[PDB]
Design a protein around this ligand. Structure first.
Ligand SMILES: Nc1nc2c(ncn2[C@@H]2O[C@H](COP(=O)(O)OP(=O)(O)O)[C@@H](O)[C@H]2O)c(=O)[nH]1
Ligand SMILES: [Mg+2]
Lengths: 179, 181
């Protein structure tokens, strides 16, 4: 209806508040955890490692390794059968600070012009060594000879603080069959 | 068998913790009430259906606006609470809670819950509100807010007397088991 990003606060400020409140201490241990402050030096705060398209009817896997050659992905084509149901699986790692409202943004092009925009909220996550996973609700691919064709996508991962965590390009082809 | 995650949000003092403690322990606190209840799971039956309901309380303070949303991921159903004797908590749903829950989780079902139902008829509570030129939230007013936020269900309960309390959690489950695509 409106919404506005809350003021910023470090992990230190969050941990130091209500330091005598027993339930809030457990609350923080459940959400942020306790023990060794583990970090991977030489790594941004977010790092999205791969985006997969869960398609039960598809023959082989249709994924994108985001740690690899982005320039080949920019030139490659992922095939999606018209009208098929799918879910997108994201793998990523939060490093030092909390990520508020991490989200995926996509600008779709056809014949060189922008024809569609789409996004999906991944959420807010706390920093930890182990990677997180995220699946969006089931979606259906476009259907019809009007929608069938090749699209050029410009994707990126941003957040409530407008920080670009990743940007890349890839091509999508919606066809009558997997081939 | 089945796993359903439920998160409870709303203003401080509306009764989020008492609602969860009263429901899970079968007794109203009325003594020491922690700021936030610990995470517990209720093994419930809903018409031959084995459901494991994980419950999550939240720190409503503005100070935790950055930490609280970390519990939102993978939530199947939200309980947005407001006190039936607090118009301010009611408007906070419009100005804060609904926008926050929708920003982080655009498709997850919402159940609007009116708390402290036992106090709506309380003479002293009513007179105190009238002194400040306020009145309790009536059923039509609550139902009107539910429509404005497109909630799946509007329910009123009392953790103190337990009236309609169990119904709140049964509906949270039915919102997931019988959705709408
Ligand atoms: N009469 C009455 N008081 C209640 C009910 N629920 C919570 N309260 C009281 O409201 C205050 C806030 O309760 P609490 O659950 O900690 O609020 P929270 O900040 O939303 O968690 C306490 O003084 C409770 O005893 C209720 O159903 N009826
Ligand atoms: Mg509380």
């Amino acid at each position: 209806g409106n919404y506005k990003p809350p003021p910023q606060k470090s992990l230190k400020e969050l941990q130091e508040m209500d330091k005598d409140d027993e339930s809030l201490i457990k609350y923080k241990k459940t959400l942020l955890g306790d023990g060794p402050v583990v970090t991977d030096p030489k790594a941004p705060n977010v790092v999205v490692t791969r985006l997969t398209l869960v398609c039960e009817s598809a023959p082989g896997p249709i994924t994108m390794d985001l740690t690899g050659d982005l320039e080949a992905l920019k030139k490659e084509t992922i095939v999606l059968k018209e009208g098929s149901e799918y879910r997108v699986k994201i793998h990523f790692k939060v490093n030092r600070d909390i990520v508020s409202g991490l989200k995926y943004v996509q600008h779709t092009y056809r014949t060189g012009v922008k024809v569609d925009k789409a996004t999906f909220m991944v959420g807010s996550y706390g920093p930890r060594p182990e990677e997180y996973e995220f699946l969006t609700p089931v979606e259906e691919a476009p259907k019809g000879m009007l929608a069938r064709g090749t699209y050029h996508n410009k994707s990126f991962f941003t957040d409530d603080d407008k920080q670009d965590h990743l940007s890349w390009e890839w091509n999508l082809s919606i066809k009558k069959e997997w081939g | 068998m089945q796993a359903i995650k439920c998160v409870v949000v709303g203003d401080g003092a509306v009764g989020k913790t008492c609602l969860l403690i009263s429901y899970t322990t079968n007794a109203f606190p009325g003594e020491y009430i922690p700021t936030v209840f610990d995470n517990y799971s209720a093994n419930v039956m809903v018409d031959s259906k084995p459901v494991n309901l994980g419950l999550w309380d939240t720190a409503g303070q503005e100070d935790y606006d950055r930490l609280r949303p970390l519990s939102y991921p993978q939530t199947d159903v939200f309980l947005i609470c407001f006190s039936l004797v607090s118009p301010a908590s009611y408007e906070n749903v419009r100005a804060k809670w609904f926008p926050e829950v929708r920003h982080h989780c655009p498709s997850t079902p919402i159940i609007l819950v009116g708390t402290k139902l036992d106090l709506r008829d309380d003479k002293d509570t009513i007179e105190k509100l009238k002194e400040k030129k306020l009145a309790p939230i009536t059923y039509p007013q609550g139902l009107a807010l539910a429509k404005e936020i497109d909630s799946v269900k509007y329910l009123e309960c009392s953790a103190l007397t337990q009236r309609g309390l169990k119904t709140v959690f049964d509906e949270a489950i039915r919102a997931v088991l019988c959705p709408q695509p």
